[PDB]
């Protein structure tokens, strides 16, 4: 009988893999763009004293286009407790809607499957994927992931493609920072109880709803804790040209008069957006 | 280099530091050219225990 204002919720979002992808804005729901397939070869090293030439072989200019997909839902009430309530259902239930959209958009833009959802770069499977070698222990050939791999992966990016960041679940970073050499010394951050460099300088943006190869942070791997070879660990891509995210209209809320039968006030919300993978040569995937 | 049984060839970091500083000094300044993968084959080298 002494109700507080405390509203402990204890629910989490992800990070946002949105400010990386190239942003483009369209008014209508159907855009189209051009693409240079290949310039082709034009002219050879001909001999001298030859009053002639060769036509070579012309290039190619493809013409692509993509749609924009919509996102809608419905929620309602009873109009009786909403007048007597000790809270505000709408301002909470509305708040519950972008939280569903913001997290659904990000994941679908990552793992979307074809029809009526933008094809994420995971399921596209045209990013080149690099799988790491397994190791030996007491004769067993368990798969592993050493710091030697991480430096090899990030450095193997073609330099002329540009600067590229990296994306990975924080449990991988905790796995990297906690590695140990033969004697017992740490590899990174020798003798300061914590290794935490400024990620922005090492160009490693972090997230939390990637496949997370270390299942619940419980598969470091010596015996039956092996990484279960064939799991995603991290990605790296020049995102400003490897993947685009298009936006048409932000979310909207509109009362639905009709269907509301004087008991059930029924609101309606929706939004339109989309995405598509550009040249999926800038960008590689590390795997176990 | 010798491995368990066979004689597989390899390329160690010590073999590179010995080559670059093996150029006749009285030839002027001399740089070197290499594929990006080769440079990405010297950074990720490990000593006996665990160290880069």
């Amino acid at each position: 009988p002494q109700v507080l204002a405390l509203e402990v919720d204890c629910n989490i979002e992800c990070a946002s893999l949105l400010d990386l992808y190239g942003q483009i804005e369209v008014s209508r729901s159907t855009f189209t763009y051009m693409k240079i397939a290949d310039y082709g070869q034009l002219g050879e090293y001909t001999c001298d004293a030859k009053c002639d030439a060769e036509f070579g072989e012309p290039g190619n200019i493809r013409h692509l286009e993509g749609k924009t997909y919509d996102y809608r839902g419905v929620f309602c009430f009873n109009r009786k407790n909403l007048q007597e309530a000790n809270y505000d259902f709408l301002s909470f239930m509305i708040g519950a809607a972008q939280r569903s959209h913001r997290i659904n958009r990000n994941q679908a833009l990552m793992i979307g499957k074809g029809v009526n959802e933008p094809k994420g770069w995971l399921t596209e499977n045209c990013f080149p994927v690099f799988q790491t070698l397994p190791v030996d222990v007491n004769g067993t050939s368990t798969p592993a992931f050493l710091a030697q791999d991480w430096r090899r992966f990030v450095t193997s990016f073609p330099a002329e493609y540009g600067e590229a960041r990296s994306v990975m679940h924080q449990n991988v970073f905790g796995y990297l920072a906690a590695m140990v050499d033969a004697n017992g010394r740490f590899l990174f951050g020798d003798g300061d109880l914590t290794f935490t460099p400024d990620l922005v300088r090492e160009r490693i943006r972090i997230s939390n709803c990637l496949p997370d190869p270390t299942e619940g942070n419980t598969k470091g791997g010596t015996g039956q804790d092996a990484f279960a070879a064939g799991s995603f660990v991290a990605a790296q891509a020049a995102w400003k040209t490897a993947f685009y995210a298009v936006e048409k209209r932000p979310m909207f809320f509109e009362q639905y008069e009709g269907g509301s039968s004087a008991w059930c006030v029924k609101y309606q919300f929706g939004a339109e957006d989309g995405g598509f993978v550009g040249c999926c040569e800038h960008g590689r995937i590390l795997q176990i | 280099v010798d491995v368990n049984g066979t004689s597989t060839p390899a390329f160690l970091a010590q073999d590179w530091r010995r080559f670059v500083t093996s150029f006749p000094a009285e030839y002027g300044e001399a740089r070197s050219v290499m594929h990006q993968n080769v440079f990405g084959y010297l950074a990720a080298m490990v000593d006996a225990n665990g160290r880069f």
Binding site: L133, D136, A178, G216, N217, T218, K219 | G50
Partner: peptide, 20 residues
């Protein structure tokens, strides 16, 4: 929540010179 383990990477060094 049930007590979950915290298995961390061991002494990982080699991939090609497995001892005799």
């Amino acid at each position: 929540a049930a007590p979950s383990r915290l298995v961390q990477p061991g002494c990982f060094i080699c991939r090609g010179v497995a001892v005799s």
